[PDB]
């Protein structure tokens, strides 16, 4: 038995947050759950949710609404990883077939420290900070995450070629890992010629970290292969072994309050949280269900969309979750 | 200066033009063959450009542009950076021509399958303001600073320039491509540069997107899209994407355009070098290229020939090069368009 | 006929009092518009200017003392004195520094001035932070504006019939920084012939400065450089406050005590002399058109000072502030 | 018993003038080795960016090195010398003390001021950015520790010479950031060192107060660029910089004594020269390294022979030569 910090959230995310709590008890998840707000206070977080994650050092999250709270919880543990897994789904008609890919976007340094600068009146300077230590810890976080999950190859995106300084220090930190783990295979791509190969053959990647601006932009992108963020998991790693694993879909306020939401993203944002804790065998259960669940095409909700309310859909894959 | 006017001697005007390196030359010849064939009124004043002397001489090279507005060029191999110093050759030229504004044309082609289907693009861009910042200094080592750079100038420059497209075409929708959300000075400084000309033409229905969001859009429904801009950072990310959505960089033609001076170059910046002399390269980015340099000179009857005559060539399964998915050579491909470049208007 | 004054902080307002008597003992027809303050204690504002601006856009001409800056205990973005600065465009500062009959100092018979400038430069509050203890700070300067110091050093030249004029810089580290500056004044420098014309190296002019400094006649410089070489000269001659200051900003005229303020006294005790203003105050009644007012008061002032009799513990003697202001007003009326 | 320093004789009146130092300092038994080394900056793998090695070994073991003035550069793309001296080691604390002189007719007396300036990060650094077109941005930074170091010296400097008073000169008010890091370090350094009294005034404060009455001051500290014209400015006060000695602290105990003043080449080798200069940047070197007993007695003869006003070189106004001004030096510090 494991304790988790849970965040209800705004729009569908309550009423997504409880699917995810009914299926994880239907699928025998060792999983006892720890309900705490987060509403922006004073700038800081509620006390006893800072507390109840630093004890947990896990958490599911959800739709947030309009600082940034994204911002406050990076900096809260130094979320130093935006891991996200893009998958294909099979039911799921996509003119992109075959795809199998994670990026991993680091989320501290970049040009998201916010500095700007007017110059003269009409001129306008923001800062891109790049240091060595942020890489380097973003490169053996890398070669952990394609170890720990049978990755074949790792490739670091970049234009090192161009910003001879700041992305070739990037590069330099990713070929000095990679010696010293040679473990997984590791090549380089240039930006543009990734943008490029991403939208003829995705097939042909397979792992990928970049800076944070690439980072952000990539991370939708692959998203926008599979249906969008709404079947797309993703998951935030800081220091002292704290992990987030949100979702990231509009709160969706028209139909909040109707059981017309598709959750499986905050679920596979729970599949990959229970694969972050080595519970390989309970995700390999709720995964596969929950594809075969679409695969047969009978209980998709309406962003999908066949005709059928969230909790049918949630109904089903608690019936084929008790199963094995 | 000691500049002239550009002038077009009884008939044919006179351009520029610029072979390269790799698989440039091997297809201007092409080019000139299919004007030759098409009785077009451009001669072609060649200039050795680059990559066999890049030091001084090329500068001479320079003038036979700044004379005749209109160049149509290849591409050039870049530089060793043993110099490491700028020097992007191709860079240089559209420096010290003032060239801003970076025109791409992404369209669908019939006889090009592609994920998605029905595809009209046109990205506006900057270069020498739109961030892509050099820079870089190390303030102590492993910490480095990079400086983007956004001028309320050549925002709205680049800006009228995305409407003055609009209008003279017929399009619909503008929009900004940004990330304001996260650079709220930077990008919101060009964020209210297009509103502030947005309003100069109600016509145009104007909207803002970002980046992010932007590149999901693309991969899923990108008819929604006319006319999109940015600045000249996110622009490597559009260019590359939306390219190779209607097919490769064998299709996109693309333009730099300045104050005064235009200049024509591919969609996609391959030096090619490994397919040197292989009777392979894919023409119809090449091709496309020189037909809105045609309508730049306002000719289009010649430019529309040309460009129903490739749409025309290229819907055979045959004539597609290797880097597309064929199995043909670029001489059938050339002829074929000039099998399909009737005599309209000649013997 | 309407003038808005602006005590600022310190002894200003105690020194604005001496003025008031003494316009009042002088018959000058000016009615201030003084009105509150701005920053310092009163806190922003804020948009003081547009509390300010409003008045300069109708008197064009108004007259303050010293800001005196607040050390960042607030939020303070940048530095609000420049801001105000700013707003009306103050872009040039003007330091007379003349050594005068009745003080002695270690240096006697000097007539120079200081042209400074005061938008460009590190005076912008750009900062931030890099690492964990690693900050870093932006000096700022533009051509634009340095032409305008630039042009603001030789017009000076010739209205007042000056010899020449150096232009003060630490290029030699900064060759992008001060050597656009630098240019941007040989540039001007070239369309003024009939003006000699030097560079100097600022640790140079400075150490020259206390050798010999009758060498230099007119020098110009960018904002740092004149916050520094301000409280210099007036420190040589005695005190900041008997050195005056101007400052013009687009068509407006603004006058305030040369340096900062006499620092080490610290003292709304009176004991302060107010020389500087009167005679800022004086320099600006000579721009108002009034030559009368601000020539008898300059003599009496200047005659005064060389009575030797009234003087403060600045220049050698102990005078109350209003002793000092009634002596004034004393040889003002039987003249 | 014996020491060894290295010895860069120079461009100029220089090495007229270092044999000069020699010769007093075997006149006064001082147990010191001469090891002259040229240091002109030699070509490396790729531009102009690299020493003589020989001079390099030997500060590497000497630890303690003599400078005299040199020359400007060959062509405009060589770097400034003193800027790889302190790039090549680590020269932050630059110092340079100023002393009225009882025999120099100066319009200021009885001065007795001490100048600590930092050395590597800040605006020195050659980093600048060109934004947009007539849009220059220069670059000034400060860090933690380089600002923790030159305060953890200067501190033990004047533990170590008997002072009194401390002040922090700065513009934190308006370069808050930069400067009120620098400052908020020390005032960190002073909460250990309470033995030491210490106290901020403002640097445009401190340049009035110092031209009106100078004597109301102690030791100072600054960052780079405040130093680099602060120090020239009190050198004034004390003579200028020929006259006044100069300071630079590398670390791995690396210190470094040299004067300021020009190479003076329309007057070199005519035995014109004012050798002072230098020499108490040698006195300095003693004072540092431990031989009061030796320093105390030249500097006092260096005073006598100033104070009499018999002999002095033309910069001073007298008529006598450096060897006349040499040998009364010399024959002062026997009679001691």
């Not at chain 3, 060498?215 to 210099?232: A, E, H, K, R, T």
Request: charged residues 20%; proline residues 4%.
């Amino acid at each position: 038995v494991q304790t988790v910090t849970l965040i209800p959230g705004d729009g569908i995310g309550p009423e997504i947050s409880a699917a995810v709590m009914k299926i994880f008890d239907a699928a025998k998840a060792p999983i006892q759950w720890e309900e705490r707000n987060v509403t922006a206070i004073q700038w800081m977080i509620p006390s006893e949710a800072k507390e109840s994650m630093d004890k947990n050092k896990m958490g599911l999250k959800g739709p947030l609404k309009t600082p940034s709270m994204n911002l406050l919880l990076r900096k809260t543990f130094d979320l130093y990883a935006n891991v996200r897994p893009c998958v294909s789904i099979e039911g799921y008609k996509t003119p992109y077939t075959d795809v199998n890919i994670v990026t991993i976007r680091e989320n501290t340094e970049g040009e998201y420290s916010g500095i700007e600068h007017v110059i003269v009146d009409g001129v306008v300077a923001s800062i891109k900070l790049i240091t060595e230590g942020a890489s380097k810890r973003i490169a053996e976080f890398a070669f952990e995450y394609a170890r720990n999950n049978h990755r074949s190859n790792v490739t670091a995106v970049h234009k090192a070629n161009i910003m001879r300084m700041s992305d070739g220090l990037f590069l330099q930190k990713c070929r000095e890992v990679a010696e010293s783990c040679k473990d997984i295979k590791f090549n380089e791509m240039y930006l543009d010629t990734v943008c490029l190969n991403m939208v003829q053959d995705p097939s042909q990647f397979d792992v990928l970290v970049m800076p944070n601006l690439y980072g952000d932009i990539l991370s939708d992108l692959c998203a926008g292969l599979i249906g969008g963020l709404g079947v797309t998991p993703s998951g935030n790693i800081g220091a002292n072994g704290v992990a987030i694993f949100e979702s990231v879909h509009g709160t969706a306020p028209d139909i909040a309050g109707k059981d017309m939401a598709n959750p499986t993203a905050l679920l596979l944002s729970a599949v990959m949280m229970l694969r972050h804790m080595g519970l390989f065998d309970h995700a390999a259960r709720i995964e596969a269900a929950c594809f075969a669940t679409i695969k047969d095409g009978k209980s998709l909700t309406k962003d999908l969309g066949g005709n059928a309310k969230c909790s049918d859909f949630t109904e089903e894959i608690c019936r084929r979750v008790k199963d094995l | 200066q000691t500049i002239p006017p550009s002038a077009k001697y009884g008939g044919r005007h006179t351009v520029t033009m610029i072979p390269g390196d790799g698989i440039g030359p091997e297809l201007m010849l092409h080019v000139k063959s299919v004007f030759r064939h098409a009785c077009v009124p451009v001669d072609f004043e060649e200039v050795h450009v680059s990559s066999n002397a890049d030091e001084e001489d090329i500068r001479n090279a320079i003038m036979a542009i700044r004379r005749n507005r209109v160049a149509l060029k290849g591409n050039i191999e870049t530089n060793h950076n043993l110099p490491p110093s700028h020097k992007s050759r191709n860079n240089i030229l559209r420096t010290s021509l003032d060239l801003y504004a970076n025109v791409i044309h992404c369209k669908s082609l019939p006889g090009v399958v592609t994920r998605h289907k029905d595809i009209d693009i046109l990205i506006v861009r900057e270069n020498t303001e739109g961030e892509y910042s050099s820079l870089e200094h190390e303030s102590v080592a492993g910490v480095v600073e990079s400086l983007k750079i956004i001028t309320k100038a050549k925002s709205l420059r680049i800006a009228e320039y995305a409407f003055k497209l609009a209008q003279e075409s017929g399009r619909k929708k503008v929009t900004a491509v940004h990330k304001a959300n996260i650079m709220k000075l930077g990008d919101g400084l060009f964020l209210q540069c297009c509103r502030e000309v947005a309003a100069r033409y109600p016509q145009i229905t104007f909207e803002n997107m970002i980046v992010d969001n932007t590149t999901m859009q693309l991969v899923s429904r990108p008819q929604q899209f006319d006319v999109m801009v940015m600045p000249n950072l996110y622009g490597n990310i559009v260019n590359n994407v939306c390219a190779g959505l209607v097919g490769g960089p064998g299709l996109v033609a693309g333009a730099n355009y300045g104050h005064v001076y235009a200049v024509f170059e591919t969609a996609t910046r391959n030096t090619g070098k490994s397919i040197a002399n292989k009777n392979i390269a894919n023409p119809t980015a090449t091709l496309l290229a020189s037909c809105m340099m045609l309508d730049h000179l306002k000719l289009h009857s010649y430019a529309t020939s040309i460009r129903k005559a490739v749409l025309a060539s290229m819907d055979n399964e045959n004539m597609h090069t290797p880097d597309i998915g064929g199995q043909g050579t670029t001489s059938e491909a050339i002829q074929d368009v000039i099998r399909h470049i009737r005599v309209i208007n000649r013997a | 006929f309407p003038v808005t004054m602006l005590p600022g902080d310190g002894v200003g307002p105690e020194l604005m009092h001496a003025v008031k008597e003494v316009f009042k003992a002088a018959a000058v027809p000016v009615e201030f518009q003084e009105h509150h303050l701005s920053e310092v204690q009163n806190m922003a504002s804020e948009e003081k200017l547009e509390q300010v601006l409003s008045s300069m856009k109708e008197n064009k001409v108004a007259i303050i003392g010293k800001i005196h800056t607040p050390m960042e205990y607030k939020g303070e973005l940048a530095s609000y004195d420049m801001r105000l600065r700013r707003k009306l465009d103050l872009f040039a500062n003007v330091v007379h520094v003349k050594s005068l009959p009745g003080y002695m100092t270690r240096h006697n018979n000097l007539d120079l001035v200081i042209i400074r400038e005061q938008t460009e430069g590190e005076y912008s509050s750009l900062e931030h932070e890099s690492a964990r203890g690693v900050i870093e700070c932006l000096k700022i300067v533009t051509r634009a504006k340095s032409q305008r110091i630039a042009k603001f050093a030789f017009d000076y030249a010739t209205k007042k019939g000056r010899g020449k004029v150096t232009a003060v810089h630490k290029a030699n580290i900064m060759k992008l920084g001060d050597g656009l500056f630098l240019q941007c004044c040989e540039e001007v420098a070239e369309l003024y012939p009939k003006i000699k014309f030097e560079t100097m190296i600022i640790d140079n002019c400075c150490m020259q400065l206390v050798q010999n400094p009758y060498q230099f006649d007119v020098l110009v410089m960018p904002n740092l450089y004149g916050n520094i070489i301000d409280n210099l000269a007036a420190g040589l001659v005695g005190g900041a406050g008997v050195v005056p200051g101007e400052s013009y900003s687009a068509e407006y005229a603004v006058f305030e005590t040369g340096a900062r303020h006499p620092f080490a006294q610290a003292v709304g005790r009176n004991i302060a002399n107010p020389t500087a203003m009167l005679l800022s105050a004086s320099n600006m009644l000579r721009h108002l058109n009034l030559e009368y007012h601000s020539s008898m008061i300059a003599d009496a002032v200047k005659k005064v000072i060389k009575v030797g009799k009234v003087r403060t513990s600045d220049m050698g003697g102990y005078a109350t502030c209003h002793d000092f202001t009634e002596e004034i007003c004393r040889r003002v009326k039987d003249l």
